[PDB]
């Protein structure tokens, strides 16, 4: 039902190694669909998913020009940032941006986003009202003052409520075979004895889409949150994701442990046990 579209900007200064590199990637949910890299041989927006290939030449030109124009803008932002923090031109710095929209089942706006970071720290964020801003420090307050004066919030709002949701709805239709298909995880429990009196039970989830999932071990029906080792969800490389959870259990106590799996591809949550 619910879906997202996000664009991600990274702008990285590199004094002595040319002008700041600017990279944009766009996602619908967990599917990458477009890319731009100012270091490319001939920088342009490029398709990264088959359903975006349907877009005509006018689309690709417009998108490429936005990226080219934003490369300049984000290069100026880096220069401005140096001044705001009293920094020298000899250091390397990074501005990031994430913006976009979520839609619910009916395709209407659930919420919009537009936020920036400087050197990995929150800088400024458009609030959920799409009307005001939160600045993280006195430097970003300077930016806020500028954006308040130029009514930037109002312009973001018109995008987020119009073009953002309209284009996302188009993408969801064109890529419905994949974007609107949830692939449930394949699950199993593995058993690795580590010593005579302790064994590792590892609960696997493979080949699932989208990325969101919950894997939990219970002992006697009790969540072992503190005792569970969880790896970060990782991409398989074929659009799908993998995850595992593990616990070290006393030898002879394996059957008191159940793995629980929740994912939107499943009709109901799964319970697994070590099948000796």
């Amino acid at each position: 039902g619910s879906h997202s579209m996000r664009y991600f900007y990274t702008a990285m200064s590199r004094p002595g190694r040319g002008e700041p590199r600017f990279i944009t990637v766009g996602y619908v949910d967990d599917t990458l669909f477009v890319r731009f890299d100012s270091d490319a041989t001939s920088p342009r927006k490029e398709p990264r998913a088959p359903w975006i290939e349907q877009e005509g030449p006018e689309y690709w030109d417009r998108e490429t020009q936005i990226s080219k124009t934003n490369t300049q803008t984000y290069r100026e932002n880096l220069r401005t940032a140096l001044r705001y923090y009293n920094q020298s031109e000899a250091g390397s710095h990074i501005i990031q941006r994430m913006y976009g929209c979520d839609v619910g089942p009916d395709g209407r706006l659930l919420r919009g986003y537009d936020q920036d970071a400087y050197d990995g720290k929150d800088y400024i964020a458009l609030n959920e009202d799409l009307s005001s801003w939160t600045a993280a420090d006195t430097a970003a307050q300077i930016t806020q003052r500028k954006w308040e004066a130029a009514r930037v919030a109002e312009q973001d709002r018109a995008y987020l409520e119009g073009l953002c949701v309209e284009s996302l709805r188009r993408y969801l239709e064109n890529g419905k075979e994949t974007l609107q298909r949830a692939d449930p995880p394949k699950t199993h429990v593995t058993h690795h004895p580590i010593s005579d009196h302790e064994v590792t039970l590892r609960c696997w989830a493979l080949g699932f889409y989208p990325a969101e999932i919950t894997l939990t071990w219970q002992r006697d029906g009790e969540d072992q949150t503190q005792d569970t080792e969880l790896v970060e969800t990782r991409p398989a490389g074929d659009r799908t994701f993998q995850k595992w959870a593990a616990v070290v259990v006393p030898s002879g106590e394996e059957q008191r442990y159940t793995c629980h799996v929740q994912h939107e591809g499943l009709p109901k949550p799964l319970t697994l046990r070590w099948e000796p």
Binding site: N70, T73, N77, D116, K146, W147, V152, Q155, Y159, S167
Partner: peptide, 9 residues
């Protein structure tokens, strides 16, 4: 589709 307007810090 991207928003064509981006504003200076």
């Amino acid at each position: 589709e991207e928003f064509g307007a981006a504003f200076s810090f």
